[PDB]
Design a binder for this molecule. Sequence first.
Ligand SMILES: NC(=O)c1ccc[n+]([C@@H]2O[C@H](COP(=O)([O-])OP(=O)(O)OC[C@H]3O[C@@H](n4cnc5c(N)ncnc54)[C@H](OP(=O)(O)O)[C@@H]3O)[C@@H](O)[C@H]2O)c1
Ligand SMILES: [Cl-]
Ligand SMILES: [Cl-]
Length: 274
Amino acid sequence: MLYKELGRTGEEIPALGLGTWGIGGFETPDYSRDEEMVELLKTAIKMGYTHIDTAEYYGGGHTEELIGKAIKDFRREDLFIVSKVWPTHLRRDDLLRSLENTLKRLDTDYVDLYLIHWPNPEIPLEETLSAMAEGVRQGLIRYIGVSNFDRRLLEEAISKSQEPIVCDQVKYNIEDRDPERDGLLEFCQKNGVTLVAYSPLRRTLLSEKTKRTLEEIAKNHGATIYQIMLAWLLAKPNVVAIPKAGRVEHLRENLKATEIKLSEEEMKLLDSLG
Ligand SMILES: NC(=O)c1ccc[n+]([C@@H]2O[C@H](COP(=O)([O-])OP(=O)(O)OC[C@H]3O[C@@H](n4cnc5c(N)ncnc54)[C@H](OP(=O)(O)O)[C@@H]3O)[C@@H](O)[C@H]2O)c1
Ligand SMILES: [Cl-]
Ligand SMILES: [Cl-]
């Protein structure tokens, strides 16, 4: 498991997180596979996936309840648990209520990282960030960040926040280059913000031409095209990745990707696919 520093915190986190979207349902709760999902989370954690990415929205809250059971087999302080507040809850009272309920479902006293899940232009960012700072001051949150914020909105959040914005969680993979084109990655790299890439395998939806290039590189490394997609992200300063892995084979495979060393020419070829 590769580690990288979170923001400028002097703290290192696993550079692969465990994405939990789908676990225990999608937009609504799914109870039908609870024991199997808890077992999957424990296995991921024991394998070294101690960075866990979830949200109050996941499974209508049930994802957090499944995570809450799974973590009971481990030392809370060994885990880096990330949760997120949905855009309808960014006013002060709703945000603190959401946080508290997230802590009840996770059955834990704090989250390591709390994110604005999506921006809501109707709710002033200063109100939202002050509410989050109240959570930090009460010991409910160790660090705060944002998600789905473009560069300009990240700059605005940094200007309105009493607490450091340690990360921005955005879609980034071998075909989705919005963070590059926006200056967001470069901004993060120069300002001590960790860019957390979600859908880093693009949910396995690639084109034929990307495929041809990934296949040559994977062959040379004895790897799958998905391992190369992850190695590519992880080779970039300030980039951490949150793949969803719902099976043990994928959890093992994705962990091995943290050992791939791409050459400079490989990086250049891969950069050029977008
Ligand atoms: N901030 C946000 O708004 C936001 C938005 C979307 C997602 N996220 C977070 O980021 C996570 C990742 O996003 P994502 O699930 O959309 O995309 P992803 O991780 O790129 O795609 C997951 C898909 O790839 C498969 N997979 C994983 N490892 C694989 C491997 N080695 N080979 C082949 N397939 C593999 C999974 O299959 P199996 O499950 O069958 O292994 C699953 O179908 C989410 O769980 C969530 O925590 C955040
Ligand atoms: Cl939305
Ligand atoms: Cl994974």
